[model samples]
Target: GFVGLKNAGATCYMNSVIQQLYMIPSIRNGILAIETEDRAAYNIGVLRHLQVIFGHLAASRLQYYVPRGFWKQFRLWGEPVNLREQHDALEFFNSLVDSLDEALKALGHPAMLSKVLGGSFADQKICQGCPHRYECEESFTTLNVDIRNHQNLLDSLEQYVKGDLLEGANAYHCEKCNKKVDTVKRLLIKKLPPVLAIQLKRFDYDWERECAIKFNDYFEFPRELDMEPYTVAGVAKLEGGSTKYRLVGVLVHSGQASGGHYYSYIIQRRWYKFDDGDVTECKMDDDEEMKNQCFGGEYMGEVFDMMKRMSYRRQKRWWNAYILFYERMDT
Candidate 1:
């Protein structure tokens, strides 16, 4: 029954997170092909990759350990594990299990002892089928190692166990040490620039406030906001003898709480001829020929489309999206 319960829990947890594999662009594209009956071979390949991932996780015992903590508070985005903490927990559990097994083996009727230790002989009638039934009945009647050793191991592993720092017995006494550790961590985070802080905070919520505070505190540091130039260029001619021109530029401006939108724009140029007493104002978009010209409009359009796709992906599990964007060249 314990095995059944454990397997059920593991399977449910596995199915819950397995769909995240489809978030990958390659897997998403492959799955989309499955619907259109194009290159259906890749469908099986994608499933095989998922199967391998699950199998590897199961083999590594991650299936049992991964969901041990709550989703929001777990080590979702942190260093994998501290080697010292992992080694300590492993050794502690291993020692406790070994001690219990050794105590069970010391009983004269080892087979009956195995049944009880394995949690399969809660009933006396069940133990009667064992070949060592008589021995079990006699030994357990007077020398019950199962009861004593199980209780002892349980007590040894209790929260009150002394000398185990992980049990938090010494936390209050070591307040200064903990404060020093926190200070060092804060210093290390403060060393990161604002952009790095933003990037790191994207994956980790625990460090978000620390990073934000650190970034704001470093406001004195000189930084540059980068902008990329538009590729297309155009010149406009006015009715007057004087001429006007325009160079395409991507204008990134913020708005009020309603948010903002990006679209192609033409940088207008104004020219004045004082001797001719004429002035001209020209814009690239005013020209009919440059209407269909390519700048970053196509790329920005792709980004907008992908954002919509991502929203759909969140609302409908049946679909997915792959959004990619670029930063400015000079910063």
Candidate 2:
């Protein structure tokens, strides 16, 4: 009987559900079951059946639910007549399973029947347009119109105004609503590169922003490693370049080290030689001015600026590094 039941579609159902739910974000963590004490045993049995079913569908990783005050809450709600009846039925089945298991154990045979069942039932259906449809449509339309208007304004200003006007005329401005047109225009001129502006004009920025928000809501940023200071060592050379000394200290600003294992290190005036048996060290006068500066804050800043410039050369690449860094650092 067991073999026939397992072979007849039960195994197929289990495999399908398990594989489907495993990938679902909502159930990826695991499913939760809520039931009453009177019906708890029966619910558990049913849940075990589900596990077996889902296990056949894939590998089972079932988690049983035991709510502390869930039954009391259900009683208080009182209405939902069908739900109450369903709950009672589930509880009855659970108790039946428990009794059967106990009877079998007493007869020198044992059965493992542990499962969970019962909760607010939900129907999986794709929801069509709701109250927010107008708002979403408006947002998309506004984004596209804004991009087109901005591009038109830019073209007009460059061709007609000869860069004299800090702000474009009414055609550049959205007269329907009072926005920070002047400020936005100023920012576009100073902060935004010409290529980026052209790209934004070509695409719908509003729609892109909306999609970005949705994407972020769905996916989260990755974790970052803890930040700690690195050791900074400096070496100094003598005037005639004959003698050199070194000084080791902790770095004040904590940052990632590039190229070398350690953070930025300075070469001071120091000289050292490793002999076969002993180590020889010599210290010279304080020559802070003659330290060889390789990777300093100024150089790093220049590299960062150059990187930004390179990124800004194309619209797609613009601010991507900044976005990645912001998400990593802030998230």
Candidate 3:
């Protein structure tokens, strides 16, 4: 039996996140390689607990691994991270990674967190009146992409890097032009990380309803993503090669924004659905099942009408992908 993390109360969110990270080979190896002291007083941190957890997940014979110890250490350091309460999986992922990075930093260790998961992108402003370009580069561990009105990842990415013109009163003052001139502003990928985490903007706040709403839009994603078309180097036609990425993990949310359950689909020889203390092999043939299950929206499901006649009608599918992880292939 595959080892699963036993949910202590509402810790499924945490379990889902940890399971996804465990499936990443680079992160798993780095975590297990972390050095810890022998003394109980000397060695105590999230990384220490993570080292043990990763090791057990790698070679444990138990049917499931209860993460009570990990949760204790997690809450001892990161306050407001209650093990008994449900939290957003993405938030938990960030907090855990940040803690790991800080812990490694304190020990004078190499910054493997950022090296394996971080990437830089440029916020660029171009003067249409001239060839002068102004750009600011920043690093990020996750890319938040909008999903409204977008049918697929490619469409959303194209919209993300699409430029908008600034003219008239909104014109940019270009120093080269020495006057208010038309400008184009957009974001362009400067560097690609080994592991790319993409968060889909599926939850939004509704002022009228005074609550967060989850969109059940059908948004498809591919098994493989070609990054060259969306990179700065590609746009400028100055590149030595192209970068291609393979889908490795998907964190899914079922139910509404008010409340939900988190689970993950991770690939290690085949796709496996890790849902709390239950882990099972999942079919991912040609990505059809993945899209049907994770790409939310109305679907034709069978139901019995008021007349007691079986009817095939449209019904809402509440489950959809919230976070996607991709691994870069290097030649």
Candidate 4:
């Protein structure tokens, strides 16, 4: 009873992201449940368009749904994006949500965007030269982690939360100490939303080489995620209300940095690889190809498949994953 999005020339980015977003039941329910009295508001159509899309995704009546209304509204030239030119999916996802949230704000309502993809990070800076320290809080819709040297998601996440040393020209100017000194920076998760969105940094511009390169590094992820290890001291101490999450969606990139196709592995009753208009069955487990394609390299994959896993400098890199969605497990 799910609908595949029909690609428009090169609209696979939109299609893939939409598929992943649709898999988030909370978002689906909210967009469908939205009943706005302010029909005159410009942003109203955004919600309506989203609802229409979700409606089709829930129905078996359609094979592929075209985002005519959404495209018309979301495009820069009154034309939808998701082109062959290649764009960043994280940027697209953020912009789409921002537009929707703005629409709701115009109707004098608090933005529900955060309810589905919101979490906080506590930023702490300690001046190593003195007793001076500073603490601040920030919110994020997606956690972006660098995977340059990381072998897996845990390694990258640990790197993300680990303290960084700042010294010399990058030294911190402490208010209490009143001196430029060495400092350590730490980021810890303070709160977690129902849905956790993570984006692995896969593409980078090599300044020395004067070109952008996509990282095909091997990174492992889990089916169920326990965020307890990443939380702040207070949040970690509490006897917890299910800080656990189960994987729901994955947005994948295939091809080179200049040109590529977008696809998604969605867990809806069963696993499905939503590649453009092709909705094919994909097992959450046992699909080694699927595993290698979307979630990156697995430790077991390396151990089991001799020389099949990525080498130190891989010839064929793992698919570049744009986003990873996880749904909170109540139990």
Best by TM-score: 3
> What TM-score do all the candidates reach, one by one?
0.14, 0.15, 0.90, 0.85
What's the TM for model 3? 0.90
Writing each residue's lDDT as its tens digit, candidate 3 over 1-331 gives 5688888877878888899889888889888987734322222377788888888889988878887678766752335455667777888888778778877877888777788889888889978888888999988899888777788899888764786788889999898778988898888889889888999889889999899898888888889998877789888885344389999889999987867888899887478899887899888654678877888778899876676898897887889899999999761
lDDT of 4 by residue, 83-181 (tens): 445666777788778767877777676788876788899898868888877889999999988776776777777765677988899888887777898
Model 2 TM-score is 0.15
Stretches of candidate 3 above 4 Å error?
36-44, 76-78, 173-179, 238-242, 305-307, 311-313
Count of clashes, each model: 0, 24, 0, 1
Full-model lDDT for every candidate: 0.20, 0.22, 0.82, 0.75
**What is candidate 1's TM-score against the reference?**
0.14
Q: What is the lDDT of residue 30 in candidate 1?
A: 33
List the candidate 2 regions with Cα displacement exceeding 4 Å: 1-6, 9-15, 32-38, 48-331
**How does residue 154 of candidate 3 score in lDDT?**
92
Ranking by lDDT: 3, 4, 2, 1
TM accuracy, model 4: 0.85
Question: Over the stretch 1-331, how does candidate 1's per-residue lDDT look in tens digits?
Answer: 0000011221222222232222223323432332124223332333334434434433443223232222212221232323112111112222322332333343322322122212111111111112221111111111111111122212221211111222232222223233211110000010111111001010112354452111100000001221111000100011111111112222111111112211122222221111001112334343332222211111112224534652222211111000111112211
Clashing pairs in model 3, backbone N/Cα/C closer than 3 A: none
